[PDB]
Structure 1
Amino acid sequence: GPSVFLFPPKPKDTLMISRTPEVTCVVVDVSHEDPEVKFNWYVDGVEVHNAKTKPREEQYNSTYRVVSVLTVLHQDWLNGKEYKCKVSNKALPAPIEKTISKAKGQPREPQVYTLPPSRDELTKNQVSLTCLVKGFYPSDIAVEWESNGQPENNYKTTPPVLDSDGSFFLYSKLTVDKSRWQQGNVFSCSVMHEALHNHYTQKSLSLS
C-alpha cells in the first residue's frame, strides 16, 4: 500500500522574507492500477485550498511518487501553526493523515562569540576566523560574514550540534588572506534566529 511522508520547510526559508517556505506531502508506493491521489490540507484544523499539485514520477520499481506542496506563511510557521496533509487513494482502506509543525520548546537566543586565528596558523598563507554560535533553540539558524559593508563568501558553517543542556551550537569558519588579518581589516559574523531581537545580531573580529 501507499505510504505518506511530510516534510518541513528549509530552516533558511523560514528566516528570510524573500524565500518561500513550503511543507511537502509525499506519497510513495502508489500503484499504476489506482494511481490517483487526493490531497487535503489543514492549518490548525481548518482546510486550506492553495496547495500545488506536482506531476507524478514513475520510480524504477514501477510505482509512482506523488507530491503536494503547501506554501506556509512565515509567521504561521514561527507561531507553531500545525499543518496536516490527508491522503486519499483507492488502494487505501481509509485516508492517511500526517501532521507537522515547527520544533516545540521554549526558543532560546544564540550567544555569538568570535575567535581570532590561532598563533600556530600564521605559519600558513590563509587564516581561519571562527564564529562560535551557542545556546540556541530551536536549531533553525543562518550565519554569514561580511566586511566593510560587503559580504564575505569564502566561509563554511557546521551543522547545528546538540549540546548537553538541550540547546544547539555550531561554528562558522571564514577563510581570508592572512595579509587582510595582519592589516587590521574588520570582519563581522552575522546570525539570524527567531529568538534574537529583530531576528538578527552581529559580532565583529579584528586584529589587536
Structure 2
Amino acid sequence: PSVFLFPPKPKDTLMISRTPEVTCVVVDSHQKFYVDGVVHNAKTKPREQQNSTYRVVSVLTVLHQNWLDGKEYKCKVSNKALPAPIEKTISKAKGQPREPQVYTLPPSREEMTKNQVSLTCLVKGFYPSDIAVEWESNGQPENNYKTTPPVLDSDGSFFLYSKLTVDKSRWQQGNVFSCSVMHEALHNHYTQKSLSL
C-alpha cells in the first residue's frame, strides 16, 4: 500500500462559490485516516471503493484562504499490512506570487487554408504554476480547446498556451472570443482577454 497526496484544483481555491479539496489516494489488498499541526475527528469524508486491489481515498474540504496562505496539510493513514503508517503531506508552492500576462493571438495566415483555425492564448510570467484557463464566445463556453501544462520559464516564472479550435467561418464572420484566466495574483483572481478578426 502506497499513499499519494493531491492538491485542490487551481480554480477551486480561487472562487468562494466552489469547494477546494485535498485528496489522499491510498492504493494497492482484500480497513484508516492535521493541517499546520493541529489529532482525531474530520473535516473529511471517505468511502471504500474498488483492478483487484483496494483504494480508500479520503477527501478533505480546505478553506480557500488557508491554502493560499501556504498552510500544510498532512494525510496520515493507518494499516495493519504496513510496518508503519505513511504520512504524506503537501502545501502550496512557496515564493512571491507573480501576476500572469495574458495575450491572445490570431490564427496564422498559413492556417487560413483549412476549415478550422487555431485561436491562441499565451499566458506567461505567473507564479505559482497553479492556474485555470477557459474560453468563451459572447457569453457562451467554448468546448473544443486544449491547454498545455505550465512550463518553467528561464526567469523562475511559468507559462503555457491555450488553444481554441473554431470553424474558419465563425472566425470569418467576425465573432469575438475570450480567453479567461484565473490566478491568485490577478485582481479578483480573474482576467479576460478578447480575440476577433
- Superposition TM-score tier, normalisation by shorter sequence: 0.7 to 0.9
In structure 2, the residue corresponding to 1:176 is in which secondary structure?
strand
- Contact 2:48 2:57 (8 Å CA) reproduced: no
**In structure 1, C-alpha distance between the alignment counterparts of 2:46 and 2:192, rounded to whole Å:** 43
Q: Are residues 41 and 137 of structure 1, via their aligned partners in 2, closer, same or farther at CA, if it must alter by over 3 Å?
A: farther
Counterpart among 82, 85, 88 of residue 78 in structure 2: 88
Q: Are residues 65 and 204 of structure 1, via their aligned partners in 2, closer, same or farther at CA, if it must alter by over 3 Å?
A: closer
Q: Are residues 24 and 180 of structure 1, via their aligned partners in 2, closer, same or farther at CA, if it must alter by over 3 Å?
A: closer
**In structure 2, C-alpha distance between the alignment counterparts of 1:63 and 1:175, rounded to whole Å:** 40
**In structure 1, C-alpha distance between the alignment counterparts of 2:117 and 2:53, rounded to whole Å:** 51
Query: How much has 1:50 moved relative to structure 2?
Result: 5.6
Query: How much has 1:111 moved relative to structure 2?
Result: 0.4
**In structure 1, C-alpha distance between the alignment counterparts of 2:171 and 2:46, rounded to whole Å:** 52
Greater shift in the superposed pair: 192-201 or 79-88: 79-88
CA RMSD of aligned residues (A): 2.8
Q: Are residues 154 and 5 of structure 1, via their aligned partners in 2, closer, same or farther at CA, if it must alter by over 3 Å?
A: closer
- Contact 2:45 2:60 (8 Å CA) reproduced: no
In structure 1, the residue corresponding to 2:57 is in which secondary structure?
strand
Query: How much has 1:130 moved relative to structure 2?
Result: 0.7
Greater shift in the superposed pair: 49-58 or 61-70: 49-58
**In structure 2, C-alpha distance between the alignment counterparts of 1:65 and 1:132, rounded to whole Å:** 38
In structure 2, the residue corresponding to 1:132 is in which secondary structure?
strand
Query: How much has 1:95 moved relative to structure 2?
Result: 4.3
Q: Are residues 127 and 62 of structure 1, via their aligned partners in 2, closer, same or farther at CA, if it must alter by over 3 Å?
A: closer
Q: Are residues 99 and 20 of structure 1, via their aligned partners in 2, closer, same or farther at CA, if it must alter by over 3 Å?
A: same
- Contact 2:13 2:64 (8 Å CA) reproduced: yes
Query: How much has 1:28 moved relative to structure 2?
Result: 4.3
- Name structure 1 gaps, 5 residues minimum: 33-39
Query: How much has 1:156 moved relative to structure 2?
Result: 1.5
Counterpart among 100, 104, 109 of residue 94 in structure 2: 104
- Name structure 2 gaps, 5 residues minimum: none
Q: Deviations over 1:114-158 (max 9, x none)?
A: 111111111111211111111111111111112222222222211
Aligned residues: 196
- Contact 1:3 1:28 (8 Å CA) reproduced: yes
Q: Deviations over 1:57-90 (max 9, x none)?
A: 698x976433332211111111111111233344
Scaled by the length of structure 1, the TM-score of the pair is: 0.79
Q: Deviations over 1:171-194 (max 9, x none)?
A: 111122222222222222110001
Identical positions, percent? 96
Q: Deviations over 1:10-49 (max 9, x none)?
A: 33332343433222234445x65xxxxxxx9812111x65
In structure 1, the residue corresponding to 2:136 is in which secondary structure?
strand
Kindly name which structure, 1 or 2, has the bigger radius of gyration based on alpha carbons. Answer: 1
**In structure 2, C-alpha distance between the alignment counterparts of 1:58 and 1:173, rounded to whole Å:** 36
Q: Are residues 55 and 62 of structure 1, via their aligned partners in 2, closer, same or farther at CA, if it must alter by over 3 Å?
A: farther
- Contact 1:51 1:69 (8 Å CA) reproduced: no
Q: Are residues 58 and 188 of structure 1, via their aligned partners in 2, closer, same or farther at CA, if it must alter by over 3 Å?
A: closer
Q: Which has the higher strand share?
A: 1
